[PDB]
Amino acid sequence: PPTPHLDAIERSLRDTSPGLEGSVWQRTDGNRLDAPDGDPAGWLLQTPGCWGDAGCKDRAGTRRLLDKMTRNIADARHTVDISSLAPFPNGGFEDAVVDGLKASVAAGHSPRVRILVGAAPIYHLNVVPSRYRDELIGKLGAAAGKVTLNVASMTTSKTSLSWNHSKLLVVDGKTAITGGINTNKDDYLDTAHPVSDVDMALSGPAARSAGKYLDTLWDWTCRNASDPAKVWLATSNGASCMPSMEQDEAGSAPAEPTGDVPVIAVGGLGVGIKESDPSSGYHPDLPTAPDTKCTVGLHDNTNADRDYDTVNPEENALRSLIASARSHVEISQQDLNATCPPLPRYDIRTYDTLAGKLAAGVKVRIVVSDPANARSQIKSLDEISDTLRTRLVALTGDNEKASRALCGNLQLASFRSSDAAKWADGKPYALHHKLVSVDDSAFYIGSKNLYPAWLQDFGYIVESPAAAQQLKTELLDPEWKYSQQAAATPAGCP
């Protein structure tokens, strides 16, 4: 069974970060999209999952999500490995963690647990690691004696604004849930305007790849606990820091297949963990589009730093995923552009790839979060279409061609999940997908936004016509059904 899209992505990863294979990216065969029997699309964990109701009254997505989390953890035999943006899991997210661990202990096991969160310097931490550890210990009751906690918040670079942003749940390095959903009850659960987001659940060797990525973050995190400005750390039962929990779990036996789904796991180290992959002969011709509505404040890692690329292969991975499209791409994101200063307004290579797809007659759909959330960094959808026009002209020298491609081949809109322009409680819909789909064959689900950001992130790229058909039916077709009523008409179009 052929995988032209993964092939193209793996080529780009081998060119960019050969030395990070086996830790920050890895391609595997034999995975299973982990769907509960009776619900074959249930591996797709969207939230809230209330299409067609501005009252978001029947939240099938959230239900399925929290119960997959609980069950995955309830089945832990050795290791539970959680990462997220701060705060530490709370509300129903925490109940999943505690019920799962208690059930694991009840089954006779002694789980080792790492919970890791990134924290922006701006962010003042309500529940600090030691406070959060004590709360878990209290809720674990008599099970706490059987649970080895590691709990940490981290910031790898204040000046370059790098901290963990990956959203991972890895159990026994065998099951893994990942996507854009942070363990924050207020965004997703206790609200009449839930954030729309998506995770995916799988089992098999790609889960171990996610474990190896987390080992890479905890190796840095454990050592840098000597600097409390960067890492705050709390453990239970007098336990040491556990930097290689997943490698110990894996031992030396290779990972065993659970299905037939090929997957690339791909992450990034952000800034302040590893300067470069010295293995790499990556020598890019980088593009210099002078953005004159904000001459970048900080050093531009997204567009003008070869070294950054070598320790963040996810950037090129997403670029080549898009570039491997031969028929159509759907992009569902919070945003394509970042706030400048201090970050660059956009990723030039990403926009050049999209522009190239338009010029080639490839269909491009971009659905982003409503600008009224500004949970949105553009003042207008036309900032996206104008940038695509600028790059189109830069690459073809043909503004007439640019208008045909842009008016004929571009679908650009703000996100909606019902016929109403906003949630029934008056707040606009907020979109937090980090999703890219190509040719109804391969798709990215993970934490890496397409807009410029220099964080640790992680995600999976699946190539499966059956799975992508499910993604289309359960998410992309519904998204367009309601979002096209908020479509932009770009300047220069009828």
Stated resolution in angstroms: 2.3
Identify the CA nearest to 164 among candidates 446, 445, 455. Answer: 455
Identify the CA nearest to 86 among candidates 184, 195, 169. Answer: 184
Q: Which residues are catalytic?
A: 165, 197, 432, 457
Indicate the residue type of 382.
Answer: D
| Residue 31, phi then psi, degrees to nearest 5 | -90, 165
Q: 64, 34 in Cβ contact below 8 A?
A: no
Which three-class secondary structure string do you get for the chain? CCCHHHHHHHHHHHHHCHHHECCCEEEEEEEEECCCCCCCCCCEEEECCCCCCCCCCCCHHHHHHHHHHHHHHHCCCCEEEEEEECCCCCHHHHHHHHHHHHHHHHCCCCCEEEEEEECCCCCCCCCCHHHHHHHHHHHHHHHHHHCEEEEEEECCECCCCECECCCEEEECCCEEEEECCCCCHHHHCCCCCCCEEEEEEEECHHHHHHHHHHHHHHHHHHHHHHCCCCEEEEECCCCCCCCCHHHHHHCCCCCCCCCCEEEEEEEEECCCCCCCCCCCCCCCCCCCCCCCCCCCCCCCHHHHCHHHHHHCHHHHHHHHHHHCCCCEEEEEECCCCCCCCCCCCCCHHHHHHHHHHHHCCCEEEEEECCHHHCCCCCCCCHHHHHHHHHHHHHHHCCHHHHHHHHHHHEEEEECCCCCCCCCCCCCCCCECCEEEEECCCEEEEECCCCCCCCCEEEEEEEECHHHHHHHHHHHHHHHHHHHHHHECCCCCCC
Experimental method: X-ray
Residue 418: C-alpha distances to residues 283, 323, 431, 478, 483 (Å): 46, 31, 13, 9, 8
Residue 333: C-alpha distances to residues 25, 366, 431 (Å): 22, 8, 7
Peptide bond into 341 cis (omega under 30): yes
| Alpha-carbon gap, residue 366 to 229, rounded angstroms | 39
Strand partners for 27: 264
